[PDB]
Amino acid sequence: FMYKLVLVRHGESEWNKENLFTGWTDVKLSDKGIDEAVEAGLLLKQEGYSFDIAFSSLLSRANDTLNIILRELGQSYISVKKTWRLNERHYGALQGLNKSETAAKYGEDKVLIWRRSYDVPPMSLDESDDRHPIKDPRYKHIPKRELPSTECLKDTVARVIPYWTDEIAKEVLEGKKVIVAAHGNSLRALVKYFDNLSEEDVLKLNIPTGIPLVYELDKDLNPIKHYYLGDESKIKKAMESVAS
């Protein structure tokens, strides 16, 4: 191989217990989440990984995960860049609700379509809703028309990949060692891209929280292989938790 890229999904948040749709809601890591980040950092150290540049989203839980990892590596001084383009998928008007409140409000049929679809977004937020991204000043540098009121996975993939093209790939091609600390659906977008997954396969992909995913890439950034770091049992446990 020529290059290594490391991807990591943040751990449990304060809303995973009640199983709320999170999306762009800026919720904090839980203490379990914090501990998962510590272990992901210890794992990277044990395996000899170090980095020159780090990327994350504009959401706290990803950034806190990244900071904990870099601290464990003794690399809290490296260049860090953040972008909305690595944000979790926007879940529209589902944000803040549990699955049963969602069924009750939008109906069993529409909820079944939304869960199984690649390209049908859930009900959108109105711009007047307090949850809408336009009301958060961290997004004021982004034209309002491009801030999502909702996303299907297809929308998420379409706004992730340009960041891969313009920033992440650029750094890899300059020989920098990159880590990306992001979210389930934004990492799904990247895995779909690298391994040319079908819509069906990306919808069933369950990326384990807190386990580094390493891609080995050739001179042209085609994947040679990938693998999660650490023991098969830790990975299985984390993968079942994401499924269930």
Added chain:
Amino acid sequence: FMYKLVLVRHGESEWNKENLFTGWTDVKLSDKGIDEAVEAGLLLKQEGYSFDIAFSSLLSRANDTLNIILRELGQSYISVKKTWRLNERHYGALQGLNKSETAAKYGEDKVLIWRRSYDVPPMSLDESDDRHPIKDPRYKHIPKRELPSTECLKDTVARVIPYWTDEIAKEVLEGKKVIVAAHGNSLRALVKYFDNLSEEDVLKLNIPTGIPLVYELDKDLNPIKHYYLGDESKIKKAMESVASQ
């Protein structure tokens, strides 16, 4: 006023107990240091401070302090920029030694000159020494000739101010709310600049660890006033601790 700039010095490191000269040595914060950062963040939150951009050094202890502060503010997503120009003063061949080892090795006279001088650096590191910055890959983007083998305070000031000019001041002038999390001597450089301190006064300036220092600035970035945040007693205790080191 027109603008507010916030400066903060990191808290205790793992070498402050034994009182070792640290400089560019990349030592970690102690648990007391971590706690000082937590309190500095809680203090800023209590007082309604928020930020658009943050600056720090290339040293872990400053960056860890900054990350802790931003986490307490719920602002771990903001833009952060790091530069060697905000590094602590380089202490040359004193790095890793205590005061008595330094006296014994270099003598009482030279140690007295070094402590009182603005412009006489301590004994320099050879490029072959393991402590020399050229051996650390975090500095590989900097021409070797500009990486210090030692610094006097005058050298430190001379390499801090350009970062103020090119980056920090630029952001302040664009209306961004800036925080700088750095070190004793790099902040001394900035205080010397803002308040036009004499060489004597900057040498006696004790910036307390972990207490935010706020400058109110006019349209042209001239200081109107400054103040530390929080209770007089926390400040006094922190200032006496710095006098002690």
